[PDB]
Amino acid sequence: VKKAGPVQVLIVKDDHSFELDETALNRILLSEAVRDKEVVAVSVAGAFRKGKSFLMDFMLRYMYNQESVDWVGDYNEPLTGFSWRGGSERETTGIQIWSEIFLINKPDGKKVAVLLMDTQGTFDSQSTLRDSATVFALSTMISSIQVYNLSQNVQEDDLQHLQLFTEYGRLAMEETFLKPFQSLIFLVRDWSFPYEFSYGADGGAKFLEKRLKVSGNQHEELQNVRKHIHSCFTNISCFLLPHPGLKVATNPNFDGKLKEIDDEFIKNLKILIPWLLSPESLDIKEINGNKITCRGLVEYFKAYIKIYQGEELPHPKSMLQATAEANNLAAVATAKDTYNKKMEEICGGDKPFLAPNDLQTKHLQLKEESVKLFRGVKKMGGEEFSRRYLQQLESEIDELYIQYIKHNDS
């Protein structure tokens, strides 16, 4: 009673709560016509306004029209037909699936159910990071190709976010000799240095090599991005997509003829889409080595959500917070150290059991000297932030002093 279209299946409300739409999820992947078929699950995932819907709009044009030279459409007429682009576009965090599941014939002769999802999150604060990261983990767990839609390059935060949500994924799942996830494509959206690396998969491949080999190693432990990434996915690639031109770029709801999109962009879109979605390359989802059915998929999805709802996912700590904290603990540690070294320098060892009166005055002297030491030193927090650490130093020195009176009363 309604055309085919995009439907919200997972959303994160202001409550920071994850709202799963069971009946919507059921009505779509528990249709008898599909419920028992092996499912290929393709996901485009990224921040808001990164061009995902536009890309998936062409994906639909292909999925609906397996015919030569039309799948892209008529060079002289606008884009038309089914669309993920809804108009009054709210920024939201979650997953949309295309309501129409496609049945497609493989080279083997299998009839697979092809599932298309949009995976979206916002990254504007350490609070929304947690939510996006768990929405991206769920997406990647439930999909067989995760096309990670990035904008100009692969920035440090892009990789950090990728590790963080694969990390979240690993938590909710039991470890095996197999890799936790299948495919991952770094899709770079507005590549503008073709003279360095080419538009496309050849060129992308090369670029991702250089990027991953830097950092290089990070972050601090020997958990460097390349190893981490490669140990999570079975296949990793990267496509370099050109800029679509100013009309597409500055026009929300673009609606001009195909001809007004940049020619190099259409040309590469023409190879990218089938590169991902052609019957040959279509790739059946599997978990623990076993191919999944649309129904199987639904049960894992409900299941995975259950787990994350039960236990708490680690809250991310920002770089600025982390490095400030560290800078202050070092001040704290330096000052404690100096206090301690001098306290045994003075009072052993038992040395001369000292009048609790005399030991105390040596303690106050030394505490003051190391508290004075604790200020004067450059610290990132700002006074209000470092005050807490100053308490820390006093709290700890006192405790380190209580031990020193025992050793003395001997």
Ligand X SMILES: Nc1nc2c(ncn2[C@@H]2O[C@H](COP(=O)(O)OP(=O)(O)O)[C@@H](O)[C@H]2O)c(=O)[nH]1
- Please say whether the beta carbons of 191 and 240 come within 8 A: yes
**Cβ proximity to Mg ion, 57 vs 283, nearer residue:** 57
Q: Which two tokens stand for residue 76?
A: 């002289």
Q: Mark residues 181-220: x for contact with ligand X by CB under 6 A, - for none.
A: --------xx------------------------------
**Binding residue per annotation — 34?**
no
**Residue 183, annotated as binding a ligand:** no
Minimum gap (Å) between residue 255 Cβ and ligand X: 9
Query: Is 48 a residue that touches ligand X (CB under 6 A)?
Result: yes
351 is known to lie in a ligand binding site: no
Distance of closest approach, residue 216 Cβ to ligand X, in angstroms: 28
Q: Show the beta-strand stretches assigned E in 151-247.
A: 181-191, 233-242
User: Which residue's C-beta sits nearest to ligand X?
Assistant: 51
Minimum Å gap between C-beta 74 and ligand X is: 19
Query: Binding to ligand X by residue 49, rule CB under 6 A?
Result: yes
Q: Which is nearer to ligand X, 37 or 189 (CB)?
A: 189
What are the residues whose beta carbons fall under 8 Å from the beta carbon of 38, sequence distance 6 or more? 110, 112, 113, 284, 285, 291, 292, 293
Question: Please, which of residues 54-73 interact with ligand X by CB under 6 A?
Answer: 54
Amino acid at 112: V
DSSP 48-103: TTSSHHHHHHHHHHHHH--STTTSS--TTSB--SS-S--SS-----EEEEESSPEE
Q: Containing H/E element for 173?
A: none
In the complex, the residues that contact Mg ion under the rule CB under 5 A are 53
251 binding ligand X? (CB under 6 A): yes
Nearest to 292 by CA among 301, 305, 280: 301
Q: Does 154 bind ligand X (CB under 6 A)?
A: no
CB of 250 to ligand X, least distance (A): 7
Would you say 151 is a known binding-site residue? no
Q: Does 246 bind ligand X (CB under 6 A)?
A: no
How many Å apart are CA 94 and CA 122, to the nearest integer? 10
Report the 10 Å Cβ neighbour count for 254.
18
Binding-site residues for Mg(2+), please?
53
